[PDB]
């Protein structure tokens, strides 16, 4: 079965997606900075590389040396990302830079790594992990919403342009998923408010709920393109 | 397994959805005006009624009658819809009236038929067939795009309002599906149906709010 | 003598305010509403008043023909007539959805069709549709009204693209929270009370004239400049 | 009248906005890299500073210096931006980096420069120049559309968060304006400038949240 590359596989949604794709029999390339946590997953058929997705050169290289083993990447899941919440009046400006670097430029690196080849052979699937925050706004999310709307726009724009080469581009837009994400935010008060929101919801999506949707989209015949799947706990409100 | 109601099941997308839900073992209420094509699907455990979704009384009664046989509907697929194309400057105005009546009002009727009881048991799934024309405009499609943008907004609004009752509201947005609507960048009706089923089959606490799908090409 | 402007829903609220501004600019007007006496009590110069229900297309069309005999071709129509019937979909009277879609959508489509072929032929004219930020965003108790207003947004954009080459303009004006008669038509006294407390709580709300100034500004741009959308709301508006 | 800060004022839209605000009697701070084009505008009561908007320190300092002279900024126009077109499969990645840095981070820098003081005053207006490319995708524009969609979201989000402080946040979305971007059917820069001025000049309690404009034709 065809190689699948997944960024940010070391926890959360990416870990869950790796498990499902492995279990379907795909050989994998998993990319994250915490490369030993990747190894501790113990998946069959399964190259782990220590890669920062904002390092285009290391990124592309890892990919090339994985395709020397498993053939052309038929899919990349651009999943690596971070959420640094804050108010624009006070938030540390370097938090904006880091988020846009991973959530947007990292993802663009991911797309460019595979897009030329996929177009040439008329096959392949780009799956970008956006968010319902790419669709609407949320308190303290200004810069993060910025990255996710950009991801939404980038995805739709590329999808239109590679349609004729029979390449698929997919946007997966989760909300409220139990992962490490919220823990990177700077303000303890924001994290507390967020955690109570999810508690009050009756809890929240499991990473695997996103993973099953990602795999379902991918497993459709090449000629069927699920452009978008948006998902959230049923009880999610404001 | 629980009753599922499907409007517009006499061809195309709604037929293909009926087939997938039936194969999965759900008893069905199939609603449409050509009841004889419904009968001809010859699906097991499937009630066929002649109902125009704009006729609220006949619609409600069909559902009540069906829930007596197989118990309360756990999903309704609002799929009945029609596409009348034209330029606003010349299009016959009754076409607008009829399209909004079927595509929007009919859909509202279906939602109101199940919403109160679903909220009361804290379970239920409403699945609305919108369109990629409910997210973007197209030449000749003005009034039709209108109905589908209406469906998107109504679905979003209602979803927010029933979330606290554990009731799911899902929008399915296909494009370029081979069906009777007009009457390899085309979709099979069954491409839509697998997505509708996949969404319904998630645990009750997981709501796939939207799936938009189209042929890779075109 | 400037060009004729047609305005629907001119008997109160936003439509009345829009009529005053256009009258002040020296446009002769045709004003259309069901309360034709309130129209007449506006006392505007160069102003034809006609008792028209915009869901009655034949009367609608006719009223327009009769005004163009006097003042020449309508250079603008403001499709402003509308109503907002708020409610929960599980309990709202279904006939409220029908009435609201008939005025807010079909009414407005009637208005567009009255002028569009002629405007396209002479390569001039402006269609101004009053949508709402509820045409962009959802709001508690607004399900059906949001439906009408998203439909208005979609219809406007679609028609705008199609008549672009004929140099006709189609504009969407999307207000929120304007002091008018609108909210008073809603059925539930509970909803009305909650809504009114919301507008009080934000510090009050737009004046009708705030919308009218934006409409006039968009229209007064040269014919080759198309302001496609203006969205506006009290500054202090939030959830 | 009150100080207005305008970024990207050395050509195109930003120049046209500067002229309209100056003619209306506002003292200005003009920021851009070609300081000598700024000086060459020769506008009354107008400070010209050489600032790259991505250079946060120089940006903030320029504003502080200007507010000593003419008082606190009542508006900032975040207009500095650049458009590097390409297909994602071949585009030089540094073009993405720099577009986002200028079009998004530059704009965030400008917002953070005035936000807290405006909140404290309960007055002020932030005006962000987006695009119809921030509402709509276009061939060859993927990364650029990305930046403008980001600008739309950021603007909407910040508007909701500062509304309670009586601070206005407005997005102007033009299309096809005759400028240097690209280095009928076409808008003059002054078409944008009149809309920007009209929005600012409404009473403080009236927030024109968005204006999208384009040539009627093409
Ligand atoms: N959780 C939620 O509620 C939602 C999440 N999302 C999106 O899901 C995606 C995954 O996040 P989630 O699993 O939730 O959060 P986690 O923090 O659990 O996972 C983030 C993943 O990205 C990796 N990563 C971060 N920075 C880099 C980098 N520079 N280079 C390579 N890898 C990096 C991390 O690995 P390592 O640090 O080892 O490099 C980790 O594997 C993100 O894009 C997030 O925005 C969208 C909507 C909702
Ligand atoms: N085909 C495509 O490419 C796309 C389709 N869609 C949507 O898919 C949905 C199904 O249409 P599609 O399968 O394409 O076209 P079809 O015409 O094949 O299906 C139409 C179904 O709707 C039923 N129907 C029509 N009017 C009524 C009514 N008044 N009361 C009850 N049932 C009615 C018809 O049955 P009967 O006449 O017997 O009553 C028929 O069963 C529609 O809502 C359509 O807008 C969305 C995007 C794309
Ligand atoms: N007020 C607000 O907060 C907002 C309003 N809007 C839109 O503004 C527009 C005007 O409403 P607004 O001024 O607020 O409310 P009002 O109720 O004050 O005005 C409604 C106008 O429409 C007329 N009208 C209603 N039905 C018909 C009909 N069937 N035929 C002809 N005319 C009709 C009414 O006149 P008569 O009964 O005499 O016929 C009245 O002049 C509406 O489309 C509304 O949706 C958008 C966003 C916000
Ligand atoms: N032109 C069009 O059709 C449309 C334009 N827009 C937006 O309008 C805004 C203005 O661009 P437009 O007038 O068209 O094009 P111009 O190139 O004429 O204007 C660009 C302005 O931005 C300044 N600028 C660029 N980079 C920086 C920087 N790093 N720091 C400070 N200033 C900078 C440039 O000055 P200098 O080099 O001296 O630093 C110049 O003054 C842009 O954000 C653009 O995206 C949106 C839709 C359509």
Q: Which of A153, B89, A178 is nearest to D99 (CA)?
A: A153
Check if the beta carbon of residue B188 is closer than 8 Å to that of residue B18. Answer: no
Helix (H, G, I), strand (E, B) or coil at A178: coil
d(Cα C96, Cα B201) in Å, to the nearest integer? 34
d(Cα B124, Cα B117) in Å, to the nearest integer? 9
d(Cα C80, Cα B53) in Å, to the nearest integer? 30
Q: Which of D169, D193, D199, D198 is nearest to D179 (CA)?
A: D193
Q: How many residues does chain B have?
A: 218
How remote is the CA of residue C83 from the centroid of ligand 3, in Å?
Answer: 5
d(Cα C50, Cα C9) in Å, to the nearest integer? 11
Measured CA to CA in angstroms, residue B172 lies from A129, C78, C139 at distances of 19, 34, 21
Q: How many CA atoms lie within 13 A of D72 on its CB side?
A: 14
Helix (H, G, I), strand (E, B) or coil at C74: strand
Helix (H, G, I), strand (E, B) or coil at A126: strand
Q: Which of C150, C146, C211 is nearest to C179 (CA)?
A: C211
Looking at the DSSP bridge assignments, the partners of residue D77 are D6, D127
Check if the beta carbon of residue D21 is closer than 8 Å to that of residue D45. Answer: no
Q: Chain D: nearest CA to C238, how far in angstroms?
A: 6
Q: Which two tokens stand for residue A235?
A: 């009880």
Q: Which two tokens stand for residue B35?
A: 């009841």
- Sorted by sequence, the CB contacts under 8 Å of residue B165 that are 6+ apart come out as B118, B119, B122
Q: Which two tokens stand for residue C55?
A: 């869901």
Measured CA to CA in angstroms, residue C123 lies from C75, C94, C117, C119, D143 at distances of 10, 41, 10, 6, 36
Dihedral-angle region of residue B92 (phi above 0 means left; psi in -120 to 50 means alpha; beta otherwise): beta
B28-34: long-range pairs with CB below 8 Å, 24+: B28/B3, B28/B4, B29/B3, B29/B4, B29/B5, B29/B62, B29/B63, B29/B66, B29/B73, B30/B6, B31/B5, B31/B6, B31/B7, B31/B59, B31/B62, B31/B80, B32/B7, B32/B8, B32/B80, B34/B10
Helix (H) or strand (E) holding A89: none
Closest by Cβ to B149, choosing from C92, C153, C163 = C153
Best mutation target among C61, C89, C156, C170 (most B Cβ atoms within 10 Å) is C89
Q: Would an 8 Å CB–CB cutoff place B110 in contact with chain C?
A: no
Closest by Cβ to D111, choosing from A56, A88, A158 = A88
Dihedral-angle region of residue C43 (phi above 0 means left; psi in -120 to 50 means alpha; beta otherwise): left
For residue A205, which atom of ligand 1 is closest to its CA? 3
- Sorted by sequence, the CB contacts under 8 Å of residue A196 that are 6+ apart come out as none
Question: Going along chain A, which residue ranges are E strands?
Answer: 4-7, 28-32, 46-50, 75-78, 125-129, 168-174, 224-233
The owner of tokens 């119809």 is: D132
C-beta atoms of B211 and A229 within 8 A: yes
Measured CA to CA in angstroms, residue C203 lies from C133, C193, C199 at distances of 19, 16, 7
Q: How many residues does chain D have?
A: 218
Q: Which two tokens stand for residue A50?
A: 């220590």
Question: Cβ atoms within 10 A of the Cβ of A141, count?
Answer: 24
Check if the beta carbon of residue C147 is closer than 8 Å to that of residue C124. Answer: no
Closest by Cβ to B214, choosing from A205, A212, A225 = A225
Check if the beta carbon of residue C179 is closer than 8 Å to that of residue C208. Answer: yes
Q: Which two tokens stand for residue B154?
A: 């109504």
d(Cα B39, Cα C35) in Å, to the nearest integer? 52
Of A7, A51, A78, A81, the one to substitute when testing ligand 1's pocket (max ligand atoms within 8 A of C-beta) is A81
Q: Which two tokens stand for residue C135?
A: 């045409």
Encode chain D in three state secondary structure.
CCEEEEECCCCHHHHHHHHHHHHCCCCEEEEECCHHHHHHHCCCCEEEEECCCCCHHHHHHHHHHHHHHHCCEEEEEECCCCCCCCCCCCCCHHHHHHHHHHHHHHHHHHHHHHHHHHHHHCCCEEEEECCHHHCCCCCCCHHHHHHHHHHHHHHHHHHHHHHHHCCEEEEEEECCECCCCCCCCCECHHHHHHHHHHHHCCCCCEEEEEEEEEECCC
Name the pairing type of β-strands C29-33 and C4-8. parallel
d(Cα C36, Cα C45) in Å, to the nearest integer? 16
Domains of chain A in sequence order = 1-238 (3.40.50.720)
d(Cα A26, Cα A20) in Å, to the nearest integer? 9
Q: How many residues does chain A have?
A: 238
d(Cα D58, Cα D71) in Å, to the nearest integer? 18
d(Cα B32, Cα B20) in Å, to the nearest integer? 18
C-beta atoms of A235 and B208 within 8 A: no
Contacts of A93 in chain D (CB under 8 A): 56, 105, 108-109, 112
Q: Which of B124, B15, B20 is nearest to B63 (CA)?
A: B124
Q: Chain D: nearest CA to C163, how far in angstroms?
A: 9
Looking at the DSSP bridge assignments, the partners of residue C202 are none
Q: How many CA atoms lie within 13 A of A195 on its CB side?
A: 13
How remote is the CA of residue A15 from the centroid of ligand 1, in Å?
Answer: 10
Query: Phi, psi (5° rounding) for residue D30?
Result: -105, 125
Check if the beta carbon of residue B139 is closer than 8 Å to that of residue B92. Answer: no
d(Cα C148, Cα C156) in Å, to the nearest integer? 12
d(Cα C55, Cα C48) in Å, to the nearest integer? 20
Count contacts between B and C (CB, < 8 Å).
123
Check if the beta carbon of residue D117 is closer than 8 Å to that of residue A133. Answer: no
Contacts of C209 in chain D (CB under 8 A): none
Measured CA to CA in angstroms, residue A106 lies from A28, A99, D106 at distances of 19, 10, 20
d(Cα D110, Cα D122) in Å, to the nearest integer? 18
How remote is the CA of residue D92 from the centroid of ligand 2, in Å?
Answer: 46
Query: Phi, psi (5° rounding) for residue A117?
Result: -55, -50
The owner of tokens 């840095």 is: D101
Q: Which two tokens stand for residue D168?
A: 């206005």
Closest by Cβ to B157, choosing from C57, C90, C146 = C146
Q: Would an 8 Å CB–CB cutoff place B198 in contact with chain A?
A: yes
Q: Which two tokens stand for residue D34?
A: 């070609």
Whether residue A8 has its Cβ less than 6 Å from ligand 1: yes
Check if the beta carbon of residue C41 is closer than 8 Å to that of residue C16. Answer: no
d(Cα A131, Cα A205) in Å, to the nearest integer? 13
Cis peptide before B210 (omega within 30 of 0): no
d(Cα A16, Cα D70) in Å, to the nearest integer? 57
Q: Which two tokens stand for residue A104?
A: 């947007």
Q: Which two tokens stand for residue A237?
A: 């409100």
Looking at the DSSP bridge assignments, the partners of residue C30 are C6, C48
The owner of tokens 């303890």 is: A188
Whether residue D14 has its Cβ less than 6 Å from ligand 4: yes
Technique employed here was X-ray
**Alpha helix ranges (H) inside chain C:** 13-24, 36-40, 57-71, 94-101, 108-122, 143-163, 189-201, 208-220
Whether A57 is catalytic is no
d(Cα B109, Cα A6) in Å, to the nearest integer? 44
Could you write out the DSSP letters of every residue in C150-210? HHHHHHHHHHHHHHGGGT-EEEEEEE-SBSSSGGGG-S-HHHHHHHHHHHHHTT--B-HHH
Measured CA to CA in angstroms, residue D34 lies from C115, D26, D138 at distances of 49, 22, 30
The owner of tokens 């799934």 is: B125
Name the pairing type of β-strands D28-32 and D3-7. parallel
Looking at the DSSP bridge assignments, the partners of residue B207 are A232
Q: What is the CA radius of gyration of chain C?
A: 17
For residue B183, which atom of ligand 2 is closest to its CA? 17
d(Cα A80, Cα A33) in Å, to the nearest integer? 10
C-beta atoms of A157 and D147 within 8 A: no
d(Cα A3, Cα A26) in Å, to the nearest integer? 6
Helix (H, G, I), strand (E, B) or coil at B138: coil
Provide the angle, in degrees to the nearest 10, between the axes of the packed helices D189-200 and D12-23.
Answer: 50
| DSSP letter assigned to residue A197 | H
Resolution for this experimental structure (Å)? 2.0
Looking at the DSSP bridge assignments, the partners of residue B125 are B75, B168
Distance of CA A66 to the CA centre of its chain: 19
d(Cα A127, Cα A171) in Å, to the nearest integer? 6
Check if the beta carbon of residue B174 is closer than 8 Å to that of residue A201. Answer: no
The owner of tokens 């499907």 is: B6
């Amino acid at each position: 079965k065809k190689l699948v590359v997944i960024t940010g596989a070391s926890s959360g949604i990416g870990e869950a997606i790796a498990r499902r794709f492995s279990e379907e029999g795909h050989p994998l390339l998993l990319l994250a900075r915490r490369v030993e946590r990747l190894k501790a997953l113990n998946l069959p058929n399964t190259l782990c590389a220590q890669v920062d997705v904002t390092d285009k050169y290391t990124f592309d290289t890892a990919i090339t040396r994985a395709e020397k083993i498993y053939g052309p990447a038929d899919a990349i899941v651009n999943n690596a990302g971070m959420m640094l919440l804050g108010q624009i009046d006070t938030q540390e400006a370097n938090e904006w830079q880091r988020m846009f670097d991973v959530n947007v430029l990292g993802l663009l690196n991911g797309m460019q790594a595979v897009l030329a080849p996929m177009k040439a052979r008329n096959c392949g699937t780009i799956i970008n992990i956006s968010s319902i925050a790419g669709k609407k706004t949320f308190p303290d999310h200004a810069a993060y919403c910025g990255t996710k709307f950009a991801v939404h726009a980038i995805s739709e724009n590329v999808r239109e342009e590679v349609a004729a080469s029979n390449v698929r581009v997919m946007t997966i837009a989760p909300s409220a998923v139990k992962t490490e994400l919220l823990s990177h935010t700077t303000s303890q008060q924001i994290k507390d408010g967020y955690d109570a929101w999810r508690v009050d919801m009756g809890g929240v999506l499991a990473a695997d709920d996103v993973a099953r949707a990602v795999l379902f989209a991918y497993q459709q015949p090449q000629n069927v393109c699920i452009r978008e799947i948006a998902l959230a706990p049923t009880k999610q409100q404001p």
